[PDB]
Design a protein around this nucleic acid. Sequence first.
DNA 1: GCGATCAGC
DNA 2: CGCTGATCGCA
Length: 579
Amino acid sequence: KMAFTLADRVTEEMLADKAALVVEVVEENYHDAPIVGIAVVNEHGRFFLRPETALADPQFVAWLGDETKKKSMFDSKRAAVALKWKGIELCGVSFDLLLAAYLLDPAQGVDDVAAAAKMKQYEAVRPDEAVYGKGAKRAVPDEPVLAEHLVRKAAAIWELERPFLDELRRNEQDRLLVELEQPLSSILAEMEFAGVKVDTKRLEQMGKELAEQLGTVEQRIYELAGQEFNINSPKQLGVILFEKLQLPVLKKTKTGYSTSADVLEKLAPYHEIVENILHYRQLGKLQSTYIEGLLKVVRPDTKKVHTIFNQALTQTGRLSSTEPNLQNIPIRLEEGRKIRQAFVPSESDWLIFAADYSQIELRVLAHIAEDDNLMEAFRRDLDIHTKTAMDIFQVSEDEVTPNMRRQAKAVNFGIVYGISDYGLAQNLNISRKEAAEFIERYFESFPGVKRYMENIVQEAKQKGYVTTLLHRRRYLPDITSRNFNVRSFAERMAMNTPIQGSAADIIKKAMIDLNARLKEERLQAHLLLQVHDELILEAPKEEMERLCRLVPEVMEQAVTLRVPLKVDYHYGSTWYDAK
DNA sequence: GCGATCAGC
DNA sequence: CGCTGATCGCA
């Protein structure tokens, strides 16, 4: 339908200093993937270009790389990375419709031009899944169909820029787009392209040890069970535990029985088999997800993994990481933690450097609640769980037992997640009355936190949304629901989203400031990963002493709060040793 | 095609 | 009780 020049050569009217640009990568994983088509819409009209044509043309290449030639795009990062794998630099992206839509309303799950277009009732563009299929049926169509789709996406971006920018400006989110998320997009592009080197023989050796401890564990489970069965089947396990061996059921489920780790540790004392199933679950998880699954996505040439950071998915402003997920690499239990020995510097005589905010959520809570007891605790750099135990249990420091600190720590998680008696009682394996007593004691010791939690729910009902430090927004329409379970979950989101979201805003601003400082200092050090409240870098050995001073300082000074931001850091030959 | 489970923050 | 993603089993 839509009119445009299906051009076979590049012309200077395609290289105007403002344009909507689509550099289409249809492969879901864009790492070293083909670019199937190019669309440009600018003051002169609408243009489709074959990529072999466009990317061979020196003038088109230079227009891509010229920061002065402004481009409006959807998912710039996708385009930037696919171009990086071809040695082509993309610059001058001044508007990204994906990030604009994400900031206006994260709840829409906008992941294509069509869904962003719908927020302004622009319907003259198809959804990607209607054009390409999905997953199994993910094929590039014939040139006429492809070209009309790309040109209609570019035209949608062209028309949608100014209404998205006017709404962002009304929301006071204009700076969140221009000065935080879009510069971060570039930084994520570099991190993903660089990747993380994996020691694949370390992982294969761990794989072989786990296959033997799994074998040893399966047949003692079979011995104790008096029968062979699929241990990885929650259904067949539940029959073995609750029907054949007649173990008690503490947590009744509508369907069958729960075999969650929560239920199995209460069942450990009644039967030997239980602990063995939990050891088996821990090893089978290392084996399937972190050994086998990691090895499947290592590039066999470089032995690097190239995560994709989804910048536009989480309801709080956090990143997510896929294929592989480099934000859930084991660390808590020692045998899982060894996996991190396989994550190594990409060059001879480089080291891994990890810096992590200490208790950023509770420090952000202290800031926004202006609780004088919590702010003083941080100004004194106290152990916050110990001091919370001292206050809610009414004891001196010396009188806090390890069980008291364990319980106070779970209250502190509770407070930032949005406490409920039923939630804390579940976590602590106590009654609801006992948990409500802890919560009451917490609020008598931190009355500013109690005020804040009432005033922010009260503010979420009046406004219909909540905000973070840097004006990220989440809409909480379930705040006015007559169903108790659905309205309490909205009240929890109103308590938690400003905390978790403020913490995301701060680490995103740190990453931007860190990269400016690394460039000013012309250090070879670079970001590999973000894990929510930690940055992981690799650098030459020679740079370690300067980064021990520079990275913490940049992360501490990212934002000014009423309490200090505290950062710990470590470095070593492997991610494991950076502890 | 989704629930259960478990890894991270 | 907050936020995620991957694997597996079973439909």
